[PDB]
Design a protein around this ligand. Structure first.
Ligand SMILES: NC(=O)c1ccc[n+]([C@@H]2O[C@H](COP(=O)([O-])OP(=O)(O)OC[C@H]3O[C@@H](n4cnc5c(N)ncnc54)[C@H](OP(=O)(O)O)[C@@H]3O)[C@@H](O)[C@H]2O)c1
Ligand SMILES: COc1ccc2c(c1)c(CC(=O)O)c(C)n2C(=O)c1ccc(Cl)cc1
Length: 342
C-alpha cells in the first residue's frame, strides 16, 4: 500500500515566520507487516498547535528533523492490532501521531478514547474535550483563584482560539461575573459575544485596547488568562487589581523571536506587577496529568449540557498541514485548528 506523509522541508530560522513551504508532502509504501504489540491505524484528524513552532527550530523535547516525518496530536481508528487492549475498530489518540495517512504504531504509545464523551465528534478530543480544553480548565482551577460568586472580572487574550474560547466560557461557569476577550478580528469579537457568552470582545488590531478595557472592565481585572504576551499583556497588566492573578498559558506573540520563555515583563510592567502583588507563575498542563480524567469528564459534561460551546476550523487533507499550521499561527482559525485526514 502507498500512503501520504508530511516531512519537514526547511526551517524558518529562530527569528523567522513559519510558512507552508517549511513542509513537504511525499508518498511512501506502508509496511505490509506489523510486529507484536504494534497496531496499524487509519489517521482521522491531526492537530496543529503553537508549541510546534519551537520544534521547527534547531534548538528546543526534540525538534523536528529535516526530511523526517512530522508528528503531533492525532486521532485515528485501529485497522489491525497485535496489542492486547486494542482491537480493529477502536478509536485511539496519541501526542505523537505521525503526519501520515495510515501508520504502524506500538500500541503502548496509544490511548483509547470514548466517542460517547464527544457525541461522536472525534475532532473535539484534539480541542475543547482534549489538551487545549484541559489546559484552560486546569489553568483556571489551579492558578485562577476564582470562587463561585466572586463578581470577578477575567480578561482572556487569544480569546477566539482553542484555549482562549474555552477559558472564557469556563470563567463564567466558575464564578466570574465579567469575561472580556481580546482577539485579532471583528469577526472573532462578534462570535465571542454573540455565541460564547463573552461580555465584551476587543480587536487588538483596530480598537484602542486600553480605552476599551477601561469601558468593559470598570472595576479592573482580577484574572488574566494569557495566551499571547507582549504588548497586549502589558496593556492588560496595567489595568489589573491588587492581588490579581495571571494564568500564564502561552506567549504566542514571542514564538517567532529568539527570546527566553517565559518572556520577562518590561521594567515598567514588572514594577506594576510586583507593586500590585500580581502572581504570574509558569503553567504547564502536563504537570497535572492526574486531573486529566476529571477535567475531561467535566468538559464533556458541560458540552453535553449545552453550556460549553465548541468552535473549530477544519481544513481537509494531509497536503494542507503546512497551510493549516501557517494559518493558525497567523489567526486564520476560529476556535481549534483541525486537519481532517479521512
Ligand atoms: N501552558 C500549557 O500547557 C499550554 C497548553 C496548550 C496551549 N498553550 C499555549 O496557549 C496558546 C494558545 O494555543 P491554542 O492552541 O489555543 O492556539 P489558538 O489560540 O487556537 O491559535 C493561535 C492564535 O493566536 C493568535 N495570535 C498569533 N500570533 C499572534 C500575535 N503576534 N499576537 C496576538 N495574537 C496572536 C491568533 O489569533 P488572533 O486572530 O486573535 O491574533 C491565532 O489564531 C499558545 O500560546 C500555546 O503555546 C499552553
Ligand atoms: C517549547 O515549548 C513546548 C513543547 C511541547 C508542549 C508545550 C511547549 C506546551 C506548552 C505550550 O504550548 O506553551 C504543551 C502543552 N506541550 C505538549 O502538550 C506536548 C505535546 C506533544 C509532546 Cl509530545 C510533548 C508535549
Amino acid at each position: 500500500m502507498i500512503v501520504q506523509r508530511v516531512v519537514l522541508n526547511s526551517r524558518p530560522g529562530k527569528n523567522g515566520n513559519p510558512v507552508a513551504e517549511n513542509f513537504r508532502m511525499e508518498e511512501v509504501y506502508l509496511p505490509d507487516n506489523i510486529n507484536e504489540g504494534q497496531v496499524q491505524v487509519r489517521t482521522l484528524y491531526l492537530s496543529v498547535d503553537p508549541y510546534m513552532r519551537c520544534r521547527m527550530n534547531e534548538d528546543t523535547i526534540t525538534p523536528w528533523q529535516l526530511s523526517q516525518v512530522v508528528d503531533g496530536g492525532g486521532i485515528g481508528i485501529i485497522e489491525e492490532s497485535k496489542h492486547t487492549n486494542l482491537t480493529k475498530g477502536d478509536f485511539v489518540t496519541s501526542f505523537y501521531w505521525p503526519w501520515q495517512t495510515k501508520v504502524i504504531l506500538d500500541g503502548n504509545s496509544l490511548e483509547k478514547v470514548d466517542p460517547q464523551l464527544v457525541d461522536g465528534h472525534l475532532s473535539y478530543f484534539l480541542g475543547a474535550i482534549g489538551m487545549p480544553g484541559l489546559t484552560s480548565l486546569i489553568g483556571i482551577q489551579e492558578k485562577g483563584h476564582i470562587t463561585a460568586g466572586s463578581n470577578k472580572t477575567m480578561v482572556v487574550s487569544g480569546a477566539a482560539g482553542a484555549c482562549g474560547s474555552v477559558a472564557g466560557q469556563i470563567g463564567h461557569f466558575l464564578g466570574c461575573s465579567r469575561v472580556v476577550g481580546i482577539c485579532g478580528t471583528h469577526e472573532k469579537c462578534i462570535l465571542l459575544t454573540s455565541e460564547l457568552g463573552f461580555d465584551a470582545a476587543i480587536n487588538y488590531k483596530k480598537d484602542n485596547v486600553a480605552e476599551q478595557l477601561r469601558e468593559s472592565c470598570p472595576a479592573g481585572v482580577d484574572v488574566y488568562f494569557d495566551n499571547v504576551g507582549g504588548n497586549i499583556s502589558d496593556t492588560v497588566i496595567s489595568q489589573m487589581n491588587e492581588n490579581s492573578h495571571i494564568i500564564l498559558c502561552g506567549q504566542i506573540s514571542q514564538y517567532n523571536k529568539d527570546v527566553p520563555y517565559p518572556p520577562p515583563l518590561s521594567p515598567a510592567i514588572e514594577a506594576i506587577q510586583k507593586e500590585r502583588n500580581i502572581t504570574r507563575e509558569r503553567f504547564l498542563v502536563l504537570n497535572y496529568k492526574d486531573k486529566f480524567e476529571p477535567g475531561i469528564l467535566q468538559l464533556s459534561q458541560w458540552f453535553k449540557e449545552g453550556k460549553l460551546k465548541i468552535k473549530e476550523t477544519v481544513i481537509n487533507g494531509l497536503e494542507n498541514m503546512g497551510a493549516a499550521f501557517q494559518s493558525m499561527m497567523t489567526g486564520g482559525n476560529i476556535g481549534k485548528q483541525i486537519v481532517c485526514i479521512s
